[PDB]
Design an enzyme around this catalytic site. Structure first.
Site, short mmCIF file in Angstrom:
data_model
loop_
_atom_site.label_atom_id
_atom_site.label_comp_id
_atom_site.label_asym_id
_atom_site.label_seq_id
_atom_site.Cartn_x
_atom_site.Cartn_y
_atom_site.Cartn_z
N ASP A 253 45.38 5.20 28.01
CA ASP A 253 43.89 5.32 28.16
C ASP A 253 43.32 5.16 26.77
OD1 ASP A 253 43.37 7.69 31.02
OD2 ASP A 253 44.49 5.89 30.84
N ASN B 148 47.88 12.60 28.80
CA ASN B 148 47.74 11.11 28.34
C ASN B 148 48.97 10.58 28.00
OD1 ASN B 148 44.86 11.07 29.30
ND2 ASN B 148 43.95 11.04 27.35
N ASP C 102 41.70 11.12 22.00
CA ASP C 102 41.94 11.99 23.25
C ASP C 102 43.52 12.31 23.64
OD1 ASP C 102 40.98 13.60 25.51
OD2 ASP C 102 40.92 11.83 26.85
#
Ligand code: AO8
Lengths: 18, 353
Positions: free
Chosen positions: B187, B174, B169
């Site tokens: 994360d 992020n 991701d």
């Protein structure tokens, strides 16, 4: 322009995972 | 050839030393993975200050530790919502990863605990905010600025992949910027231990590799595709594949065609064509020479990889920081109370947390 096309997509804000 | 004797010997020795480092890092990771920590603080040890961000089953708050005065970012997850949204395995996995890894660009988990209602992960506070905000404000990053960030992701993925972890991701949303201008990855909800292949449809539409879209078994090469997307968006100000609806984005991703701004250097375009490569037998990061095809590419010729790792390179950008607990780099959210039930909820499902 390509930038204008990016604005037109409506996906300029934060993007969630699928 | 391209290298004389002195440069070839220096590069060879450098690559062997990376192997030696990663072998030790894997031994340390596996010891902590097999014996995780539990219950290292409690809620009334902290004062709650402000909400830094929220998801569909929890939020992240700036808190201050009462005894030490240190600020932290506390992720609060509602156990009942975690179950209803089918995120039990992801949540337990994220905490197990965070307590086991150790790298200068991965956020550090300082405490974790739970109560009747919620799960708590207390991490270092990264005050510079998301790369996303800075990129949209500035517009685009110059190629040296983008390269500084990209080098940190290359090293971080080299580390994670050596542990058989795929990240899945990557995106500017992020990536946080710390007080010295370096990157922190926070994360790990979609990360997975994968030595061979895996099959889950997951990620964010603009950053999905073609083999995920096409429902194939896939491997760690999806992270190197996503690195190509990230480098492109940093240097252009917009990603390489976009459209009104995800289905049209996916048509573009699988097509094998990509277009570049005229201000991109030829070196940058060559790197991106080899990362945004639909053919897995040709994609950089997936070949016999592994990560070295990326680290030795001409676009990274000026990168001192050890200096980046040691955080000795001057960052191109330092976020505004007025002091401890400064939150000006984060969005504003409405504050909701933290209710803790008199009855334990979902105790069996979160026993290992
Ligand atoms: O709340 S977060 O910014 N959230 C991470 C970035 N936002 C992720 C995101 C949120 C919404 C949509 C897509 C992606 C966050 C989390 C963990 C540790 C932190 C430490 N210091 C500051 C913030 C931290």
């Amino acid at each position: 322009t390509t930038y204008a096309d990016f604005i037109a997509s409506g996906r300029t804000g934060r993007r969630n995972a699928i | 050839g391209h290298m004389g004797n002195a440069a070839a010997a220096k590069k060879g020795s450098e690559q062997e030393s990376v192997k030696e480092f990663l072998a030790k890092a894997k031994e340390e990771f596996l010891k902590k993975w097999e014996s995780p920590s539990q219950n290292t603080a409690q809620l009334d040890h902290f004062d709650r200050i402000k909400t830094l961000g929220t998801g569909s089953f929890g939020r992240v708050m700036l808190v201050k530790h009462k005894e030490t005065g240190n600020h932290y970012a506390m992720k609060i997850l509602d156990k009942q919502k975690v179950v209803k949204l089918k995120q039990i395995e992801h949540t337990l996995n994220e905490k197990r990863i965070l307590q086991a890894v150790n790298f200068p660009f991965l956020v550090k988990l300082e405490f974790s605990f739970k109560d009747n209602s919620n799960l708590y992960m207390v991490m270092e506070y990264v005050p510079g905010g998301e790369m996303f905000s800075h990129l949209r404000r500035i517009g685009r990053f110059s190629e040296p600025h983008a390269r500084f960030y990209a080098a940190q992701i290359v090293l971080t993925f080299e580390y994670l992949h050596s542990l058989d972890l795929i990240y899945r991701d990557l995106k500017p949303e992020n990536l946080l910027i710390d007080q010295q201008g370096y990157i922190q990855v926070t994360d790990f909800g979609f990360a997975k231990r994968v030595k061979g292949r895996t099959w889950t449809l997951c990620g964010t539409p603009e950053y999905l590799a073609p083999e995920i879209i096409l429902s194939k078994g896939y491997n760690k090469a999806v992270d190197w595709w996503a690195l190509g997307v990230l480098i492109y968006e940093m240097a252009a100000g917009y990603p390489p594949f976009f459209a009104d609806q995800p289905i049209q984005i996916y048509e573009k991703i699988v097509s094998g065609k990509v277009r570049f701004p005229s201000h991109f250097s030829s070196d940058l375009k060559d790197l991106l064509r080899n990362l945004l490569q639909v053919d897995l037998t040709k994609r950089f990061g997936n070949l016999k020479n592994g990560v070295n095809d990326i680290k030795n590419h001409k676009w990274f010729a000026t990168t001192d990889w050890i200096a980046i790792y040691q955080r000795k390179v001057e960052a191109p950008f330092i976020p505004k920081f007025k002091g401890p607990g400064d939150t000006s780099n984060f969005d504003d959210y409405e504050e909701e109370e933290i209710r803790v039930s008199i009855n334990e909820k979902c105790g069996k499902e979160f026993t290992e947390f």
